[PDB]
Design a protein around this ligand. Sequence first.
Ligand SMILES: CC(=O)CSCCNC(=O)CCNC(=O)[C@H](O)C(C)(C)COP(=O)(O)OP(=O)(O)OC[C@H]1O[C@@H](n2cnc3c(N)ncnc32)[C@H](O)[C@@H]1OP(=O)(O)O
Length: 577
Amino acid sequence: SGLPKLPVPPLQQTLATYLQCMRHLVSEEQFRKSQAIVQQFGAPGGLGETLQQKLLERQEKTANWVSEYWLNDMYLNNRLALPVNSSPAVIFARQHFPGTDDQLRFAASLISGVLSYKALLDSHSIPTDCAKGQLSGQPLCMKQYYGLFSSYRLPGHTQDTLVMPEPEHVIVACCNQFFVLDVVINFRRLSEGDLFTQLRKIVKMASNAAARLPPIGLLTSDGRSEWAEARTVLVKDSTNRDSLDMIERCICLVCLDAPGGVELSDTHRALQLLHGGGYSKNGANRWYDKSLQFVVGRDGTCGVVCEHSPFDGIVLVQCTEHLLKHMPLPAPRRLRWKCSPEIQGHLASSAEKLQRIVKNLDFIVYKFDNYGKTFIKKQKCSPDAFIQVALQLAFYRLHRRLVPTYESASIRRFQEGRVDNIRSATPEALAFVRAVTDHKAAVPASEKLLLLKDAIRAQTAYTVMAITGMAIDNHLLALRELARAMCAALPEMFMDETYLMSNRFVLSTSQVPTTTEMFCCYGPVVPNGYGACYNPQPETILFCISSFHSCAATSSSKFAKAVEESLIDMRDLCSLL
Ligand SMILES: CC(=O)CSCCNC(=O)CCNC(=O)[C@H](O)C(C)(C)COP(=O)(O)OP(=O)(O)OC[C@H]1O[C@@H](n2cnc3c(N)ncnc32)[C@H](O)[C@@H]1OP(=O)(O)O
């Protein structure tokens, strides 16, 4: 690989940055105890320097010293059910399908797009991406592509595990029934015309009452430990091993959803993609372990549910946008399943667990249309920095406090680079939000403007630092797991209540820009948090906001309102004179 290896930040740089990031997010007392804790950990000849030495060694022996640690910490270790908690959804524009054939024609074409896109992939014919935005021109890592269709996430009791065959095939799910659709014989990739024909056969078969099998997919929408256990039960029978193996070895799935009941709003269409609406809608017409699940609903609701561990939103969207821009026949096989009274019980639990997730998701698509990048650029500001500050102002004006915030910073500059964290809850953002919201202080508007720019200055400074591998989250993560390898009892540095708080991201954000008329979204990462995915355009900014109804403190409608208001105030501050 001609790409640089992810840098190893100097120990003292990270420890200083660490403390600086949290000072204003914890009490004075607690902060004093942490300074002391950090001081000892980072003292000369201390424990910190010892771990750093191990890290430099690991760096030299590996391609990317955090891939393993990060992949397990961020996704494989998480026990929450994938729907909403982990697996994001990309929603395509609304389609219009008068007759079933219009739905199946779409699905056929889409599948042909997948095939040829997998061809370019297999022949490394895909053009190597370059940076754009913040520090642009350099080559980017492409490894994430080659994870799009070649992955499956196996459940495990405490830790999940991430992952050619012949014939090559896709699994088509209709009416919660799973079918095997071979798409490539001997490098012969079926015609869009024959794929259509095969799909009509599946739809017909999935409508036979005497053959209808139990909704096994439902099992994959359950907590990872629960699915690991129920799968252990299935594995006892040979017929189930077989079908599971088939699902495990497919390219992706193609879900032919039944007509959704509600209105086809952007919000409702997204709900359908995130969780399918529960077991009574399309909630079982899935298999979350698989990487990509392309949805082609009868009514026109389409998109693709994605299993996060193998790749991130940027890569996914380029493939997706490429897919859409592109846009003797044996019968398809139906996967068999041999259920027992055990499985019947498990399907019941999953059904109830999945209903809570659907019942608990408070989601909304907000499109800000007063202005976009263009206006922001006219203020000598980074659109993303501006938007990140906007979100801080929204959280504070609504909740009266700032909280540890997360923002996906892509590090694909380096080998196997995924992402590091940009902590937007800066001290300069606290001073800005306090000046704007504290009426009593009567801070002059000209002063608010200064603080606004200073805030946008710190966000951009952290961003630059994060995308160049000099941030602090991955670094600390690596130091933590190395120490654990030394002794199961972690140092006080990582048992400190301060370190623990810094990682509960009550505000989890990311940017997924797209040229098309599609958008990305996902659930919060903590019970009392928000999920904010935005798409900044020249004149608009699309906000996808999520939170949990279980937390009386959060509200996606109120937060969206608060974002609008924050963007308006900032436009006003910038239009003074
Ligand atoms: C499953 C999922 O979906 C979740 S996974 C997460 C997926 N997303 C990511 O990983 C985020 C990837 N993006 C990055 O890492 C970026 O570096 C981040 C940190 C988001 C920053 O994005 P950027 O593209 O740099 O945005 P930003 O600088 O604000 O805006 C870029 C434009 O804003 C301009 N600009 C920046 N500072 C400016 C300034 N001071 N004055 C005038 N213009 C400025 C840039 O020149 C650029 O112009 P153009 O390309 O539109 O012609």
